[PDB]
Nucleic acid binder design. Structure first.
Ligand code: ZN
Ligand code: ZN
Lengths: 116, 126, 119, 95, 226, 126, 226, 95, 119, 116
RNA sequence: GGAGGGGGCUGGUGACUUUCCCCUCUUUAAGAGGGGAGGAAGUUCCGCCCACCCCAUUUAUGGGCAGCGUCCCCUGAGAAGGGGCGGGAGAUGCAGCAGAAACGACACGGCUCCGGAAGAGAUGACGAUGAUAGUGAAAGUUGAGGACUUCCGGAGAACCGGUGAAACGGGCAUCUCCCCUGCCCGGGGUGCAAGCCGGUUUCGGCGCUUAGCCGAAUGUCACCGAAAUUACAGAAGGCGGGCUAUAGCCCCCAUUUU
RNA sequence: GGAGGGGGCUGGUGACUUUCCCCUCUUUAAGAGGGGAGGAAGUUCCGCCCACCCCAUUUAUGGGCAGCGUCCCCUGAGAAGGGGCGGGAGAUGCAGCAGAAACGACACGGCUCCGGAAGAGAUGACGAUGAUAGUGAAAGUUGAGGACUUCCGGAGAACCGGUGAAACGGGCAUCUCCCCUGCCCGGGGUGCAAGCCGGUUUCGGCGCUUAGCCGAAUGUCACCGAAAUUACAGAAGGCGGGCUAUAGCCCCCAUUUU
């Protein structure tokens, strides 16, 4: 509600959920996505919208903008963990190696159009 | 005979000629306008201020007129022309036209356009 | 009351434009310039007796006054073993401040107790 | 928003300011944004980059709003940025 | 060079323009003013070659209830002018600091024109004293002397405390109009040729400021164009 | 109420008190001697010179009298006392006794010997 | 401090001594003077405390035949004084260079007091102009103004050419006597406080020189004793 | 004989002359006879023998006659000894 | 005429006291002082057009102007061989002037002719 | 008449005539008396009063006063020459040696009393 | 060179008039000579001399002042201006809201022990909002076929509290005493409009003056000089210190500028 | 250091007012800018440009100016001020009185010769107021038993004239020509109130202005400076020279004085 900077369409929102499920080479947790963005291996950072409290992921949009890493939002926290491969919901997921989803992650990079 | 040598221009008085006009409906005589000025100098200047200014009227035919005063005290006698309010049934209001150092510039700046030189032609003829 | 509320509408922007000007100047490298803006923002808050926004609250070290850019001059971590809290530490001076979420942790404990009793 | 009525309560920091009249001949014609503000001295950085010390009481400033331009004397602009927000009323007369 | 008089016809207004005057003031000495006098006064100004600024007048009412009333009446006219011999009316007029000039402190009180403490409140409130010439026109010998010694006491307070001075003929008929030069010569008579010249400028400097305030959108000495 | 604060001594007027006496056979009233002085100032000083001098009469019981004038213009008003010649059936001739800065020295130098202080004792009693 | 007046009784002479005066002049305005007026005038001088110098007067006769006549009459009295409005009498009076003072150039001619060439012949002949105060006492408003502008013209010629000036009340009765201080104040009114003081000295410096000449055997400013 | 009336025509050479008043302070008090005479300068030799230069116009001389003493100014004594005998008339006034 | 004769009575003493003052100063040795007195005496004679006395006539050399003291600066002799005359010569300058008495010599010739004719 | 400075009494006038006749050692002439006074041998110089012209003996009183030689006058020119020893009158006689008249010439020196 | 700040100096001479005032002297009544407002006189925050009353006649006790320059803090173009002078003990205050808790420490929540309830033995409970887990447990490195727990109540050694200007601990401000070092001893109260005297309500004199007025004097002009009657301002018993407003020129500093 | 004399300089800037004047420009009628009396403008002793008439058209003749600085003379406290510029010839003047004679020389008296009268031969005449007597005979040395003369008249070589400012001889002053040296060539007469033009007595314009008025303007205040609006004085076509009156400061000189 506060840390979200842009409104994400629903048709591209499933494409974030498709890219994480296709690759399955990901880091889960709020600490592991922070280590991935400062090293620069992370190509896309997925942040849930329904977090509470918001302070655990509030530094994720401000760190992704300064490092130059593209990022977008997903409305559900539980559907992010199910696509990641866990029964428990994860707040955020960053991708290291896309594999088959390298063709998809360029299409997620149209979020820069949503930024301006 | 009564004949006095004119003072040298270093010792002679410095004078200015006040062109004025009384604008009204009724008429005024030459003996009236010399009296109302002299009554105005004794009220404003006083007896001491009269000798400092030396007021004198030379000529009055039209509502226009030419009045004599000192060069240093044109400012005080011009306020004497405006403070006189009435003459016994009828108001007074003197409007000045300008001042000059001679009759020759005062007669052509505001009064008229031409130059008559009448003092020279009546002295040698009569 | 009407002149007090209209001044508060003015001063709510005066803490907002002065803080956003501090954010874009802090990434330029001039940390002394960004410290000057928030010092004017910390001074103008106590004259009107108005509060800081909740977004710009945790961005400033309370000791020195430098703007914290996450990663540049700020080391933020999530420590959740003993008690769940996030810690901001200034790389310039060295002060340490923490934000516990124990009152928000207590709700999901109480929400899971109601889900076990209903099921 | 920025209005000419509330420009005496507005923060000058972050506004393009140019000077049209001044007693000192060097201060006339400079354009830039205000960075810092004291009681009777404005700090304006140019587009060239030169920091110039401008007193308020001796000159008149032309503020750049969102499109609009406002001409207000610096004699109305006496005071620190702290106490100018609360209540500062000045009266000027051109005599 | 600014004159304050009461307009009756065209011929006296045509006469004052021919001699020295540049612009003058319509002096409505009544509580009944409207646009009917204002549409005629523009016809006299555009008749030969002139500019007229119209002003209103109030007289002998209470202290603070007159202040709330005349502030509504001043929004329709250009300038205002307050007269009064009572000192509690003279003191209450300067605190409102929206009046431009004040007249007649010598004919209502007949004791003294301006006090010492009255000049100090006129400093930060910027209220000028207006001098009148209609008074000396219809007095007697000692009565002309009494208002003149009152005027000399008003000049020294306005010179030391820098209070602006504006002269007026305060004329009523066709012939009470005077020229500015004898009025300059009468003020040159009293104190100084330097102080007599600055009086004519404060006559001029008032009507530019009052006009330019209500000409365009100017609020608290700040104009907004474009 | 009519109450005016007295001017500071830097801004207040500088005054001298003229002691004089009218020596004759006939009698004069207080209203007569204030009128003949005021008629004398308008003839000598004028209307402009009256405000420069500020003439004032305070008290007249005897043929003696005390008159007020400015400090710089004692010389011009003393000539005003001597030029008045007659009052409607009978001459006038004012002889001055001296001038001083206060009532206290003027009342004891030429007028009398003792000091009465009457202005203080009638203000608080009445 | 020297006064010129006409003695009638003792009381007015006793009054002028009580105020300011030191010594004064008996002014015999007739062609009939003798020792009978001279034996009375010493009794008034020794009455309270006084010194009197008696002088005679001649008026409206011819130019040069009056000069041979009054030179015989001056040997019996102290001083002489000539009056006249005719310019040929005024010019003839200064060439004889034995007269001390001259009066009335404004009431007989009614045109101008002293000419420019008349002041230059008074330089090497050392004849003083005497100013009168009896004239302004019984004039009208404009008539007081005319003699005063004549007196201002007489002061500038006596200041530039250094002609001595002596004032006189020229009194006739008991009450036309004035004090010297208002007479000093009237001359301080006209031109200067410096020139007003020197006039009183030339009033004094005449009567010492005329007395010391006929006191002892003094001929052509040379005294012989022992 | 020597008379005070003809003392302006008399020859000063051979007469004891002393000065009572003078503007210069040294010339007051000297006594002696006159030896030489010019237009405006008297030459007096003292009893001491010192020749002293005395101008006439600035001082007054006291002449010694046959017994008598006469006080006459030197302002009456202007002129050379030649033309003073023929006709010289001077008029003085103490003002 | 009366003022002319009274001035001549004055000026007869002025050539007499100035010459007698020259005589007693000439024996003192100051010949320049005695020359000054008679030069004033020779000058005052021609303004009035009056003559010198007969006693003081032959005492002065007409060339230079020095007073002649007989024997001191004057060499006087009686030469009576050819024509009877006395000669004064100044020892200072050297001029020569003579006084013949031929008109007085002619009388004693004429007196002795009348004595011879009567006897 | 002119060169005579003092009036001589008649009783002493014969004593000048007695002194010249008793001595008879004298110089006669106007030139010889001038040579005698400048040398200083002359003790008394006798000058006649009735000379004409007076210039021949006019220098005799002025030369006798400066040299300090006593002198007096005699009224007759003819009686001076008869006492001197000549029939022709002599204008002046000066004495060199008195002889028997040395007692007389001191009495002629009372002419200094006649001088003052 | 231009707006500004701080410090210092602010009269002398000559003439007129005792009718500008005071004092003195002589003298045929008037003349002569000398002196005449400031650095603040304003402000009344002070003290003393001077007066009067009360207690006391004491440096035994005790009282009063000072710790300066220097240094510390705050504000301006950073020259300059303003305030304060060490330490110990006790009491009160830091509202409101927020925070576990607001001035001495504590209770309370994470840690340990005991009791009760629920689920469960290749299952189920929990866990990437952090799991068995360690360190002087603020902080920081760690990060999962990890894995036996979760809640409530009571008692306790050690460590740490999302707020706010400021906290398991040290500050700030005020008041009162005891610790210091130096100097001086009558201690308080009022005050010249005090107080005293002829007088006996009221008035005159004294207290009062190298200006000394009181119905409140100290004036005018010229000039050297350049410190000058211009700005602010005018004595009322005197002197000393502090604050306040500024003219003219000299000296010092800053910014703009070159 | 003090009375005095001579020489030099005498305005600039800012403000007010076109109602102090002129000129220029623009402009809803009034504003802005610039300039505005001197070393004498006074005195009229001058000249020229400029104008008009007469003769002449000439450096052939002739006219005009200059001989400066320097020097000479006169007067004052001797610095300073005033006047004049060589020579030759001719004419007049130096009165009055005095002197032989007063401006070229002379006559006259002392010297010589002749004539007449008076006195006289160891006498008489004369002579110390000068005798026979000399010198280039002004002057000076001489000075007596020295000693033959004295007077009048006429004629002549040499030398000298008691006076007076000044003389058997040289001066002074004025006027006119011929002798000089240098330079320049229309020569006189009047004059801006000249002269010209519309006009045709009278008036307006031109001649007229880096002030240009004419019934005659050029003003007031402040200040640096110290040369300042103070003294004397005020334009009338301009310029140059001479005389006259003086303020302020600078420079030079004198006397008193030390
Ligand atoms: Zn920090
Ligand atoms: Zn000789």
């Amino acid at each position: 509600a506060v840390y979200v900077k842009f409104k994400v369409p629903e048709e591209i929102q499933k494409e974030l959920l498709d890219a994480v499920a296709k690759a399955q080479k990901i880091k889960k947790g709020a600490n592991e996505v922070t280590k991935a963005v400062e090293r620069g291996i992370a190509k896309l950072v997925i942040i849930a919208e329904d977090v509470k409290p918001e302070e655990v992921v509030a530094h994720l949009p401000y760190l992704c903008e300064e490092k130059g890493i593209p990022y977008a939002y997903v409305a559900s926290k539980q559907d992010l963990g199910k696509a990641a491969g866990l029964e428990v919901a994860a707040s955020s997921v960053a991708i290291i190696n896309e594999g088959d989803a390298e063709e998809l992650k360029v299409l997620i990079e149209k979020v820069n159009v949503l930024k301006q | 005979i009564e004949m006095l040598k004119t003072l040298p221009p270093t010792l002679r008085e410095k004078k200015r000629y006040i062109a004025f006009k009384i604008l009204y409906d009724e008429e005024l005589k030459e003996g009236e306008v010399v009296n109302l000025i002299r009554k105005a100098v004794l009220e404003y200047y006083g007896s001491w201020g009269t000798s400092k200014a030396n007021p004198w009227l030379v000529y009055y035919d039209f509502p226009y007129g030419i009045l004599r005063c000192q060069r240093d005290n044109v400012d005080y006698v011009k306020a004497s022309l405006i403070l006189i309010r009435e003459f016994k049934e009828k108001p007074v209001n003197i409007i000045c036209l300008g001042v000059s150092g001679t009759i020759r510039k005062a007669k052509i700046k505001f009064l008229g356009i031409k130059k008559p030189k009448r003092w020279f032609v009546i002295r040698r003829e009569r | 009351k009407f002149l007090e509320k209209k001044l508060k509408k003015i001063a709510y922007e005066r803490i907002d434009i002065l803080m956003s000007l501090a954010e874009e100047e802090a990434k330029k490298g001039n940390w002394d310039r960004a410290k000057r803006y928030v010092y004017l923002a910390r001074r103008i808050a106590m004259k009107m007796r108005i509060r800081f926004p909740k977004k710009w609250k945790r961005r400033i070290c309370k000791k020195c006054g430098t703007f914290l850019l996450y990663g540049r001059n700020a080391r933020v971590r999530i420590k959740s073993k003993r008690y769940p809290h996030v810690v901001i530490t200034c790389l310039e001076c060295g002060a340490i401040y923490r934000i516990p979420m124990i009152r928000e942790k207590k709700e999901k404990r109480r929400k899971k107790l109601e889900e076990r009793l209903k099921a | 928003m920025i209005t000419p009525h509330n420009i005496l309560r507005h923060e000058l920091i972050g506004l393009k300011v140019e000077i049209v009249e001044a007693k000192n001949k060097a201060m006339i014609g400079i354009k830039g944004k205000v960075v810092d503000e004291t009681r009777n001295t404005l700090v304006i950085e140019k587009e060239d980059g030169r920091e110039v010390v401008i007193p308020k009481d001796i000159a008149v400033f032309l503020f750049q709003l969102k499109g609009c331009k406002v001409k207000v004397d610096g004699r109305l602009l006496i005071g620190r940025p702290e106490e100018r927000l609360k209540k500062k009323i000045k009266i000027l007369y051109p005599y | 060079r600014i004159d304050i008089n009461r307009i009756e016809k065209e011929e006296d207004i045509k006469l004052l323009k021919e001699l020295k005057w540049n612009g003058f003031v319509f002096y409505q000495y009544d509580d009944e003013f409207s646009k009917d006098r204002y549409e005629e006064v523009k016809a006299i100004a555009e008749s030969y070659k002139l500019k007229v600024y119209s002003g209103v007048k109030i007289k002998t009412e209470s202290s603070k209830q007159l202040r709330d009333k005349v502030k509504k009446f001043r929004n329709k006219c250009h300038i205002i002018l307050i007269e009064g011999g009572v000192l509690k009316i003279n003191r209450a007029a300067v605190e409102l600091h929206d009046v431009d000039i004040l007249s007649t402190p010598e004919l209502g009180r007949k004791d003294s024109g301006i006090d010492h403490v009255l000049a100090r409140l006129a400093s930060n409130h910027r209220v000028a004293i207006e001098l009148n010439f209609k008074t000396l026109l219809n007095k007697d010998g000692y009565e002309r002397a009494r208002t003149l010694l009152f005027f000399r006491n008003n000049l020294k307070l306005a010179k030391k405390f820098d209070v602006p001075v504006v002269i007026s003929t305060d004329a009523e008929n066709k012939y009470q109009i005077k020229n500015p030069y004898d009025l300059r010569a009468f003020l040159n008579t009293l104190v100084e040729p330097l102080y007599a010249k600055k009086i004519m400028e404060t006559a001029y400097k008032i009507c530019d400021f009052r006009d330019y305030l209500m000409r365009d959108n100017v609020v608290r000495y700040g104009v907004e164009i474009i």
